[PDB]
Amino acid sequence: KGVVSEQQFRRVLDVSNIKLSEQDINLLLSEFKVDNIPNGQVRYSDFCEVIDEIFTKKAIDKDPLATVTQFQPETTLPARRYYLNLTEEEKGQLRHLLN
Amino acid sequence: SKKTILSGFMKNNSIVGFKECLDSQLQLKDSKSEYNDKFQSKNRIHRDTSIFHIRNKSQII
Amino acid sequence: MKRVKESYFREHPHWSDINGCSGAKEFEGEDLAYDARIKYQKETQKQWIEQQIREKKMREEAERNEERAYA
Amino acid sequence: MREIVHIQGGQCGNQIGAKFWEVISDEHGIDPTGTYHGDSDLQLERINVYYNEATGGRYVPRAILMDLEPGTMDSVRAGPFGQLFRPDNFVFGQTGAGNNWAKGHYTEGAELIDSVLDVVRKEAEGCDCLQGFQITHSLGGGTGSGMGTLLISKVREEYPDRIMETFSVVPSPKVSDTVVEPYNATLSVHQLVENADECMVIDNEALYDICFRTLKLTTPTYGDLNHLVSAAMSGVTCCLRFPGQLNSDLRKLAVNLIPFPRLHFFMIGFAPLTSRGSQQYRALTVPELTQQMFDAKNMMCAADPRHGRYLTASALFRGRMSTKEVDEQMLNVQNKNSSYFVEWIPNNIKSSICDIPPKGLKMAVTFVGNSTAIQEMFKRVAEQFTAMFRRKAFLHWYTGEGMDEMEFTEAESNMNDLVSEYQQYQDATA
Amino acid sequence: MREVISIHVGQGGIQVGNACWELFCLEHGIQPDGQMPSDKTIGGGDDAFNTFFSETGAGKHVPRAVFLDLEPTVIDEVRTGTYRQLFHPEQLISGKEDAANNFARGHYTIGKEIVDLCLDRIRKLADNCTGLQGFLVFNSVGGGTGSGLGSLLLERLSVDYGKKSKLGFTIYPSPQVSTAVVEPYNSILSTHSLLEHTDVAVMLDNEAIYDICRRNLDIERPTYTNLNRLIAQVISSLTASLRFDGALNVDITEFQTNLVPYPRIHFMLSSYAPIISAEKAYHEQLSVAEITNSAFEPANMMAKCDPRHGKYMACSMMYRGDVVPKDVNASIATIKTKRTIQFVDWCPTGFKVGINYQPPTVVPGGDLAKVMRAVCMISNSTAIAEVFSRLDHKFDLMYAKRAFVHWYVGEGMEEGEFSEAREDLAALEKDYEEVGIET
Amino acid sequence: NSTDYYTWEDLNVGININLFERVFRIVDCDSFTKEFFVYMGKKMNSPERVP
Numbered sequence A: 001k002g003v004v005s006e007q008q009f010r011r012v013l014d015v016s017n018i019k020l021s022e023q024d025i026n027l028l029l030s031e032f033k034v035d036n037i038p039n040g041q042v043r044y045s046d047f048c049e050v051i052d053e054i055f056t057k058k059a060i061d062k063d064p065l066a067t068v069t070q071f072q073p074e075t076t077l078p079a080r081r082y083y084l085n086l087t088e089e090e091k092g093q094l095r096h097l098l099n
Numbered sequence B: 001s002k003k004t005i006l007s008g009f010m011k012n013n014s015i016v017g018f019k020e021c022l023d024s025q026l027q028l029k030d031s032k033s034e035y036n037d038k039f040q041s042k043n044r045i046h047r048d049t050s051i052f053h054i055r056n057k058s059q060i061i
Numbered sequence C: 001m002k003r004v005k006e007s008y009f010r011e012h013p014h015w016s017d018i019n020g021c022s023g024a025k026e027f028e029g030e031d032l033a034y035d036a037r038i039k040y041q042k043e044t045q046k047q048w049i050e051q052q053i054r055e056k057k058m059r060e061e062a063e064r065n066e067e068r069a070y071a
Numbered sequence D: 001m002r003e004i005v006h007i008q009g010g011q012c013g014n015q016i017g018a019k020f021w022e023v024i025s026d027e028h029g030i031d032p033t034g035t036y037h038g039d040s041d042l043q044l045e046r047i048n049v050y051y052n053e054a055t056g057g058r059y060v061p062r063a064i065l066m067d068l069e070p071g072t073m074d075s076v077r078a079g080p081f082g083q084l085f086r087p088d089n090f091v092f093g094q095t096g097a098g099n100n101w102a103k104g105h106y107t108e109g110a111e112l113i114d115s116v117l118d119v120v121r122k123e124a125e126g127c128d129c130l131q132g133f134q135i136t137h138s139l140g141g142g143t144g145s146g147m148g149t150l151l152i153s154k155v156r157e158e159y160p161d162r163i164m165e166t167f168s169v170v171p172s173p174k175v176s177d178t179v180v181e182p183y184n185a186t187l188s189v190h191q192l193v194e195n196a197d198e199c200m201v202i203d204n205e206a207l208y209d210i211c212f213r214t215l216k217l218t219t220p221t222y223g224d225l226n227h228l229v230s231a232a233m234s235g236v237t238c239c240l241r242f243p244g245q246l247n248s249d250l251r252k253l254a255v256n257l258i259p260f261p262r263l264h265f266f267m268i269g270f271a272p273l274t275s276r277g278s279q280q281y282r283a284l285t286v287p288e289l290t291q292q293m294f295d296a297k298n299m300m301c302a303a304d305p306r307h308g309r310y311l312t313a314s315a316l317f318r319g320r321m322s323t324k325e326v327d328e329q330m331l332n333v334q335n336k337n338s339s340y341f342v343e344w345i346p347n348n349i350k351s352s353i354c355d356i357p358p359k360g361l362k363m364a365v366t367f368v369g370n371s372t373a374i375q376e377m378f379k380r381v382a383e384q385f386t387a388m389f390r391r392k393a394f395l396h397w398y399t400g401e402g403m404d405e406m407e408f409t410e411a412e413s414n415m416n417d418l419v420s421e422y423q424q425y426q427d428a429t430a
Numbered sequence E: 001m002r003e004v005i006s007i008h009v010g011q012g013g014i015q016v017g018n019a020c021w022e023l024f025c026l027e028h029g030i031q032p033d034g035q036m037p038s039d040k041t042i043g044g045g046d047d048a049f050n051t052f053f054s055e056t057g058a059g060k061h062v063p064r065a066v067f068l069d070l071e072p073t074v075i076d077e078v079r080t081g082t083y084r085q086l087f088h089p090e091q092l093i094s095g096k097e098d099a100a101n102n103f104a105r106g107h108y109t110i111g112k113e114i115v116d117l118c119l120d121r122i123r124k125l126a127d128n129c130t131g132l133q134g135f136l137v138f139n140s141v142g143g144g145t146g147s148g149l150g151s152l153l154l155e156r157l158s159v160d161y162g163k164k165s166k167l168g169f170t171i172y173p174s175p176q177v178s179t180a181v182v183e184p185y186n187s188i189l190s191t192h193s194l195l196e197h198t199d200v201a202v203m204l205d206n207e208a209i210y211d212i213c214r215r216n217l218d219i220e221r222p223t224y225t226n227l228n229r230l231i232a233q234v235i236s237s238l239t240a241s242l243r244f245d246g247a248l249n250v251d252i253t254e255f256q257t258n259l260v261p262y263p264r265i266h267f268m269l270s271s272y273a274p275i276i277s278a279e280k281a282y283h284e285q286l287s288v289a290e291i292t293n294s295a296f297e298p299a300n301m302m303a304k305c306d307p308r309h310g311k312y313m314a315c316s317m318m319y320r321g322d323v324v325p326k327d328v329n330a331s332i333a334t335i336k337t338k339r340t341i342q343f344v345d346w347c348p349t350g351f352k353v354g355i356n357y358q359p360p361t362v363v364p365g366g367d368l369a370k371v372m373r374a375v376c377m378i379s380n381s382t383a384i385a386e387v388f389s390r391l392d393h394k395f396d397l398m399y400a401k402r403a404f405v406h407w408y409v410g411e412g413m414e415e416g417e418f419s420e421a422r423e424d425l426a427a428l429e430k431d432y433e434e435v436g437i438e439t
Numbered sequence F: 001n002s003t004d005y006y007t008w009e010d011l012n013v014g015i016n017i018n019l020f021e022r023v024f025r026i027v028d029c030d031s032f033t034k035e036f037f038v039y040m041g042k043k044m045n046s047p048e049r050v051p
């Protein structure tokens, strides 16, 4: 059909060994869980495609111009997204000690 | 240029009387099957009591 | 043969043309185009008079050129 | 409820129908393409009679078109409203009969009955409660009248209880248009009396008679003559589709216009019909309609009604009108002309009213009356037939296709008997 | 993965074989030099050149033929003409001394010095292809070289390769018109060898085509160059299904399965239509129904044998062009109705119908004009008993006094060989009659 | 499943042709193609090498 129970959604994440935060767990549900006051019927059709977009760009056909992503050590690099970048305000002192 | 264009690769590999049936008969919703029209309609604790009997001869079908 | 014309002059009316005619009041048979048609037709007839006479003499003069040359 | 099917054959039969379905069509508001756009709710209450339903809601007349030559039915389609007829119903051959009755009744017409009759038996069976059949055909063409009559005989043997209507056009002797007419009319007319329940006679000479002198149209054409017949033919079944003061279907008219089984020949007409140049002097009131419906020149049959005596008459008025002025005016015409009316059947006129007048008109009437004047038509046809037969002229055509000369004598006698017997009453007294 | 090896033996085969290649060469966009132009390519589908050609890796192609003849004049012409670049240099194997119409000469004495080389060349071409369907062998019976070489090569092939199918498109002597004076002698001997070693062999007598040329093309001055071309079209017809698309095709192996009721009776005669010149080819519709009428007209038969004197065993009659299957149904039915074509009692239906789309090509400079629909027929009929009938009678007259015999006995062949051929031909005469008797 | 057919004036280099929902990118022109287009009189587009 295109929808699975919300709780069963939690089942895959725990089994898949990929760890997620509770507030993040809320984030996925708010974006994917079927728009209903009660629970149940969380649709993975939208989630599965986007997450898998990094492997091979499914459905490449029908658009010859487009070229899939190559991905590289720079793909996990965005995993570095963090608030530690503040040092970018002034890295000169970091430069001085380093040299 | 009426019937001289005939070619063997065109006559044989072009279906004649078995293409899609003309419109006005395709008006059907493949997703709607019986047991879905009424049982799955929704149901309601209170029904809309309103009834009406239009003052025109009901169409015979 | 087939009959695709009601008469020699008017094509069958456009389907929107017959609004009435349910009762015998509109007929398209009362003409009222008869006078106009005759006037235009008679003038056209004269045109073929002049056109054909010109060809005939042109043939004759060339024919008479045959005799004069023979002289 | 009590609908009627249509079976029009032969060219002259084909053209007449070519406009008839256009006439009634504009009455109920059926568009040329088959979608409904009518205004009044009543314009759809009783549409079942002439029209049938199909998926997608488009409406198809339940008519049968038949002929032996391609020209008739390959042309009617190209005109307005030419697509309403269903493609299957068309039945046409490949040869043609050439006005030879023999070609139309034994060799080509008979061989082609199997297909044509099949469609009729399928179409009629689909009715809820059928009323009958109406046949339009011309008696001047061999191919038309040839298989035209044979169809009537076959139908009667399997539908004994449904009425049978036929509007035949027979050639008047003043304007001659076919040379082999006498053979076709005399033999064909023999079959109609024995089988047909009712037939209203129509003559071209009158159509011109009506056109020049009352509609004052300068140049008549074949289209105009068709128009008047169609309007008149719509009147006979006028009230069958609409409510009225006194509803009167076809069976009702029969019960008041056929004194005896073998006198079933009528003559009809329409009124009013005012000239484009006269509609501002005439006054539309009930008295005007009654007088014109009896005037001799209006009748579609060349035989003047005043040469004999009336036996039965019916008038189906249209629109709203005081039933007083129908009865009183109708009674008016039966006391000041006692010489023209048979005596042993008192008040020999029928009355009816329909509540929906023809579009664009307020009062109108159609007549159906069996008059002894029709005796004139049979005599003129009979006189010519005997003249041409004493020398066996043109007889080699029919004798060479399995038909023997005895049948012609039998046709003459029964037709000969009709003329004499038909007048055993106009001299009869109580 | 389908192929066929072409063998031309004798001048009659060579000259007709020469003709069959211009038609084949054009039909796939290959110029005389063998190189496919880098521009103006007309090729439908791929591998089409594979049925008769083999790739050289880049550029041109090669024909799959081996020409054999002991007379250098005929062979030497090709190597100096405009098709020199086409053939492989060392496959035009030829000798020095002519056969001289002595059938023994090409089969016992002179032939043995070339047959060994010919087979070896056949070995090389056998390995190159993958699943060879069969061979096509062309030869003129009326000559010792064609008759002598043909028998020797066929017998070796029947033992070297085995069950593979082989076809022989011979040219038998005419009833009254014949160029040679010893043709009857080598005709009887040839059929003796070719009856026991070939699958399908057709009749192509010269005299009939002369009538074929005159009636339609309206040309009173024909020569062998025009004659051979007509055989080219029939050559194309029989193989239309092996290198093209279609709706209902036929394989070459589906010929020893529909046209030979018994092993012995396997002689069949053809017929072609339409053949209408460019001056008149465009004033008629050329319907499928009417064209097949010309196919069975008695005069247009490929050979001078009137079919009306016998039975019709089976006609695997082929199609090429714009033919819809429904029309073919109406054409087969109409033929059976006619009373002038009468079949055998034990063959209710005798038609194997085939269809191909690629229309016939037009060879420039020839006589044929372009058409839409063409039907070539390979029909087996009891009328063929006549052709063997007259040939046997002619043999009787000349051997009563055994004139011309002593030019053979000096070639090493035993005397009894001549009489033996009569047993094969004569016994064949009694077999046809037995096939046709109603039971 | 339609009733409209191509006319040679539709094909061209650099444009997308529709063929069984698969998208084709016709890229290069053979030597003989150019002349016919110039002869008939419909413009021709500049080529580019195939990635």
Ligand SMILES: Nc1nc2c(ncn2[C@@H]2O[C@H](COP(=O)(O)OP(=O)(O)OP(=O)(O)O)[C@@H](O)[C@H]2O)c(=O)[nH]1
Binding pocket: D245, D246, D247
């Ligand atoms: N007073 C009055 N009489 C009527 C009316 N309608 C019909 N009639 C009478 O009916 C006679 C005509 O025939 P009907 O009796 O009406 O026949 P019907 O009513 O159709 O009966 P069926 O034909 O059997 O259905 C007239 O003579 C009238 O006397 C009406 O509206 N008022």
Ligand SMILES: Nc1nc2c(ncn2[C@@H]2O[C@H](COP(=O)(O)OP(=O)(O)OP(=O)(O)O)[C@@H](O)[C@H]2O)c(=O)[nH]1
Binding pocket: E009, E010, E011, E012, E013, E015, E016, E071, E098, E099, E100, E101, E140, E141, E142, E143, E144, E145, E146, E171, E178, E179, E180, E183, E206, E224, E225, E227, E228
């Ligand atoms: N169809 C056709 N037959 C030919 C042609 N040329 C010769 N023939 C036939 O060949 C027969 C005689 O044999 P040749 O063609 O001269 O050659 P051969 O049979 O191989 O014998 P050799 O000439 O000694 O090699 C004649 O009876 C002809 O029927 C030709 O160009 N076309």
Ligand SMILES: Nc1nc2c(ncn2[C@@H]2O[C@H](COP(=O)(O)OP(=O)(O)O)[C@@H](O)[C@H]2O)c(=O)[nH]1
Binding pocket: D009, D010, D011, D012, D015, D016, D099, D138, D140, D141, D142, D143, D144, D145, D169, D171, D177, D178, D204, D222, D223, D225, D226
């Ligand atoms: N009402 C009417 N009758 C016509 C018209 N045209 C011809 N006729 C009549 O048709 C008759 C000829 O019928 P014909 O065509 O031979 O019938 P067929 O034998 O079935 O082909 C003539 O006698 C005319 O009176 C027309 O436009 N209207």
Ligand SMILES: [Mg+2]
Binding pocket: none
């Ligand atoms: Mg009543």
Ligand SMILES: [Mg+2]
Binding pocket: E011, E071, E098, E099, E100, E145
């Ligand atoms: Mg030689």
